[PDB]
Structure formats: structure tokens, C-alpha cells
Motif scaffolding. Sequence first.
Motif, short mmCIF file in Angstrom:
data_model
loop_
_atom_site.label_atom_id
_atom_site.label_comp_id
_atom_site.label_asym_id
_atom_site.label_seq_id
_atom_site.Cartn_x
_atom_site.Cartn_y
_atom_site.Cartn_z
N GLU A 61 0.82 -1.21 0.00
CA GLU A 61 0.00 0.00 0.00
C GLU A 61 0.86 1.26 0.00
OE1 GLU A 61 -1.94 1.37 3.82
OE2 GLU A 61 -3.70 1.43 2.49
N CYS A 63 3.99 1.54 -1.06
CA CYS A 63 4.75 1.68 -2.28
C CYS A 63 3.86 2.23 -3.38
CB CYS A 63 5.37 0.34 -2.69
SG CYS A 63 6.19 0.36 -4.29
N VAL A 64 2.61 1.75 -3.45
CA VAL A 64 1.66 2.25 -4.43
C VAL A 64 1.41 3.75 -4.23
CG1 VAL A 64 -0.78 2.17 -5.10
CG2 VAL A 64 0.53 0.05 -4.94
N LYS A 65 1.16 4.16 -2.98
CA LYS A 65 0.89 5.57 -2.72
C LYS A 65 2.10 6.44 -3.00
CE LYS A 65 -3.13 5.34 0.32
NZ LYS A 65 -3.72 4.15 1.00
N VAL A 73 3.79 -0.41 -10.42
CA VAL A 73 4.05 -1.14 -9.19
C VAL A 73 3.58 -2.57 -9.36
CG1 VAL A 73 3.57 -1.39 -6.74
CG2 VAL A 73 3.97 0.87 -7.73
N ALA A 75 3.24 -5.77 -7.29
CA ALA A 75 3.22 -6.21 -5.89
C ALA A 75 3.64 -7.67 -5.77
CB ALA A 75 1.83 -6.04 -5.30
N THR A 95 -5.79 -2.08 -3.52
CA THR A 95 -5.04 -0.91 -3.05
C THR A 95 -4.42 -0.12 -4.20
OG1 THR A 95 -3.65 -0.27 -1.16
CG2 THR A 95 -2.70 -1.73 -2.79
N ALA A 97 -2.16 -1.55 -6.91
CA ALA A 97 -1.02 -2.05 -7.67
C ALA A 97 -1.37 -2.22 -9.15
CB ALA A 97 -0.55 -3.39 -7.10
N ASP A 98 -0.34 -2.21 -9.99
CA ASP A 98 -0.53 -2.36 -11.43
C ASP A 98 -0.40 -3.80 -11.90
OD1 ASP A 98 -0.71 0.56 -12.22
OD2 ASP A 98 1.23 0.54 -11.17
#
Lengths: 296, 296
Positions: A61, A63-65, A73, A75, A95, A97-98
Motif C-alpha cells: 500500500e 509503495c503504491v501511494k 508497481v 506487488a 489498493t 497495484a498495477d
Amino acid sequence: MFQRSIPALITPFTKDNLIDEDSFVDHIEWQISEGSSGLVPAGTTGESSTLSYEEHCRVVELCVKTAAGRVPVMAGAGSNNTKESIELAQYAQNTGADALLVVVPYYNKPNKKGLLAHFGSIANAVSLPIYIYNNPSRTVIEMDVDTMAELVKTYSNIVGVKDATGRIELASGQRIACGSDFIQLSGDDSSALGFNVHGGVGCISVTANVAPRICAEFQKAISEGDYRQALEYQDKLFPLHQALFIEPSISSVKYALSRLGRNVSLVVRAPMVSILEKETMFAIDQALDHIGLCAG
Amino acid sequence: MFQRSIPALITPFTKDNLIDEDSFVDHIEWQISEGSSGLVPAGTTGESSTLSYEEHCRVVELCVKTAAGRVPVMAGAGSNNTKESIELAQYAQNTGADALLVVVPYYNKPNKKGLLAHFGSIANAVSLPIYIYNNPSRTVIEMDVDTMAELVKTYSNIVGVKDATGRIELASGQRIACGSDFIQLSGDDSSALGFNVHGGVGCISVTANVAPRICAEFQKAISEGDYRQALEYQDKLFPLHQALFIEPSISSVKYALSRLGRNVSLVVRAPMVSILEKETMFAIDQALDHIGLCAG
Ligand SMILES: *[C@@H](C[C@H](O)CCC(=O)O)C(=O)O
Ligand SMILES: *[C@@H](C[C@H](O)CCC(=O)O)C(=O)O
């Protein structure tokens, strides 16, 4: 979506063994500003194995933000327990992630039918792109190319691999069996160069934690087809790639980041230990100084 | 304390994927009355990888409560996360287990200092006896004899090994380095016989789940030094030992149990699958016939 230099991010910890959220954020922001093209939070180098469910989630969460859409991103969302994998995967999706990185299950050694059940069950539970992470030197079993081709043909959201075998003939085999649209990323820093000329388009790298700019320049030269220049970067980076897994790379990476003045503590979670042999630290130091990474 | 035939107990599941507690209790009662000398709940054959922390604790507690002192219980407390191992070991101690089975960490590949930290941390957190579970065919890394001997000399409650390598020259090396008071148990059914003649005193067995009586008679003959009769048992059990790991043993064992008429469902947890190839089922069936066990 994923190409060039992608760090498998360390997870820094505090002196009290909490997630050092400030250091993690600074690390990500530094990685992006230095040219890394995507991020893998809570992977192997991220000490996924010693994170709680809630810490793992929090790391994805965060890292995404932090990435804020500047880089994609991917995960970490894989264990040897399918139900838990589905839970990590759906969290990553919800959350933001890509994409998902899903390791071949370790320890309980499923057979081929189990691999199909594992990856298929995950692919049906999310709509995110999934990358198969093949690392037999840790998982013992190795997903073979027939199985990988079968998964690609069956599940539209199984879209690539992280290939950590370091046997680049497999890159040719995977390209032929799965199609040239299959996204191949090297999972082995030391053979990333040859991996790409066989068809890879990037590297999920350990070393990029420590030296993100030259790893990025290295991958940029390759993507421009300046292979003469890529070989010059390889000769500079290779001693560092090697020095960082004399002992477990998680310890070695944090040692190096702290030496470089980054705000990363040495703390790791058992069974990793932060104490390195002096011969190991000396090898890392010599390789860092050959690249010229110490600011002072 | 731990000797002869000790099954690594399966964990049965209901059709709804809950722990089938009545089946687990029945399996334990059957094992004891057929002559098994100990129990290992929630080990590898117990599908520890796919149990939640809570279910793992429930399996151990239920095994301890069922055994009720009749045979000693060696609880699975293995993971590749040291903190979690401590919690599993302390739960086992507080619920009444007699010993702990602790696998060398898998997947994250600690070095020797990491093994000392992992096993040392566990030895400091409990007072139960600890058995080192060495199985590099699943962990990649193998604890060497110097590391074992050092753990044994350092911590009074590190008392034994499960040695699943199947290279019995290691039993001699471990006997000489760690002393003949060190308790060595085979973790490889097919070489249990030679393991004991090199100094072992028992076997933590996959096959005992299926044929507890014959395995018990096999180990009894070895302990009485009737090695001629033990070889006769080996020739009758060997095809069953080998048939049970053509495909993953947790599936193969549950299939064998149902073909025997026991109340064990075939359900296993992904990434394991219960479907076996026709040839695998037939090889198991013929191995079961060869021990008259079902047909004759
Ligand atoms: C992937 C990056 C590297 O492949 C780690 C390789 C290793 O085996 O140490 C990851 O998830 O860390
Ligand atoms: C111990 C018994 C056997 O060593 C399992 C053998 C295997 O590697 O499958 C256990 O914990 O199951």
C-alpha cells in the motif's frame, strides 16, 4: 508496462523491528529520481517471508501511494499457500497495484498439476496482470516451458515471467512457446544483459537497490541497442552483482545502502542476520568504489 | 523418548475444507493401537504450509489431547520466519507437546550464521527438546555437521535430528561429531533401515500413515537386532515407500488411506491437488496388495 531496471525493493526496519516507513518512502523516491522504471514491493529481497500479512499489505500500500503513478508497481503476492496468495493478490489489486509477482511455490513442491491449480486459481481471483516468478535455486521445483505456455494460453491476465534461473536458453524457449508478446524480465542481475538479447525487456534487480542510476543507464543502453556500451556497464556492475550475494543479498544490500549514507538501518529479520564477514564487506566496498558510488 | 516408527501425521480435511477433527482423532487412535511409538502433527506431511497459524495450533493441540500421554508428541514448529517459529514452539509447549520438530528455513536460504540465530532463538524461547529437521530436497540449503554439532554443544535442549537427506554417511558423521547421546531419526522411509544401523534409533515416516503396523514391526525388528527379518520387511515395504512419492506424498497417502477403507477424505489444499494419474494410483494399489494389506 514493465521494462528496463526494476528494483525488488528492500523493506527497511527500525531499531525496534517495525517497518521504517520513512526510510521506505525515501528509498522509493530516490529509486525513481535515479531512473528505476517500476517497483516490486514485498518480494524476496523485500523479506516477504518475515513480514506479517498486515505488514506485507502495508508495504504494498505504501509503495503504491508513494509511486503516485510515476512508475508502475508490481506487488509481491506469492507464497506456497494458494489461499494466502489469493488474499495478498486481491489486496494488491484493491489498493492500486498495477501487476502481481507470483513465485512458484517453495518447500511443499507441487507437481505440474498443482502449478496449474495455483496460478490458475490466482488468475481467476484478480483481473491484474500476473508475472510468474521462476526461481528454482530457492523453490527447488522449476516451472517448465510447457506449463508456462499452457498458463499463458489459458489465462489472459498471465502476461510474463521473472526468470531467475540464469540459464538464458530458457529465455529463447519461453519466447518461442509463449509468444514474443510474453513479457520476459530477468530475475538474475549477472545475466540480465544476455537475457535481454534473447528477448527479455528488463530486469527485476537486487543491485538496483544499491546502484539504481547505473543499473538504469545499463538497461537504457540495452534498449537503445548500444550493446558495446551495455558491455562496458556490465564490466563495471558485475563485481558488485557478485559481491552482494556472497552472503544473503538482503543483508548485503542494507549494509551497502547504509555505507553510502542512505537512511537505511542494518536491521533484518531472523533467519537473516545483519552481521557480515569482513571479507564480504571488503568485497562490497571495493565493488562500490570501482563504480565510484561514495559521495564523499 | 522418540524411537522406532513415528508417523508424520497427515491433516485430513472435510469436503468444505475445514480440518476434519473426527478423522484426525481416529487416525491418531488407529496409529497408536497399531504400534506407532510417537506422533509428529503439523509437519510437512501434515500440510503445515497450507494451515493458517490458528489451524496449525489446533492440529497440535488436538493431537496432544488425543495422545494423552500414551505416546510422545513432537509438534511441527517449522517455518522460514524465526519469529513465527518461536510462536509455534511456545504454543506447542504451552499446550502440552513433548518435543519440537524445527525445519531448516526454506526459500530465503539463510547462511550458517542465520541457522545459528534461527535455532538459537528457538532454543532460548522454550524448554522443550528440539529436533533439527534437515531436508535439503525441500530447503535447498543443508545444515552441515559442524553447525549441528555446535548447536548441540551450545544448547542443552537441542537433542536430535530428522535426517531426511537419505545419505546415510551423514548419520555416521553426525554420530561422531554430536556424540552417541544425540538422537538421530531417519526422515527418509526408503533408507531408514541403513540409517539405524549407522546409529539411528527410529524413523519419522510417510509410510507409517498408511501401514503403521508393518512399519512398527519393521522398526521393532531393527531394535532387537534381527536385521535378517528387518530386510524381509524392507523388501515388502520398499515398493510402497516408492509408490507414495511418484506424485506428492500428501495426496498419495490420503488416496492410499481411502483405498484401505479409512475415513479420510481425499481433499488437500492448493497448491497440492488430489487428482493422481492412473499409473500412480495403480502403482500404489499394487504396492498395497504386495503387503497383502488389502487384497489377500
Ligand atoms: C526478485 C529479484 C531477484 O530475482 C531476487 C533473486 C534471489 O534469488 O535472490 C525478488 O523477488 O527478489
Ligand atoms: C517429515 C517426514 C518426511 O521427511 C517427509 C519427506 C518429504 O520430504 O516429503 C515430515 O515433516 O513430513
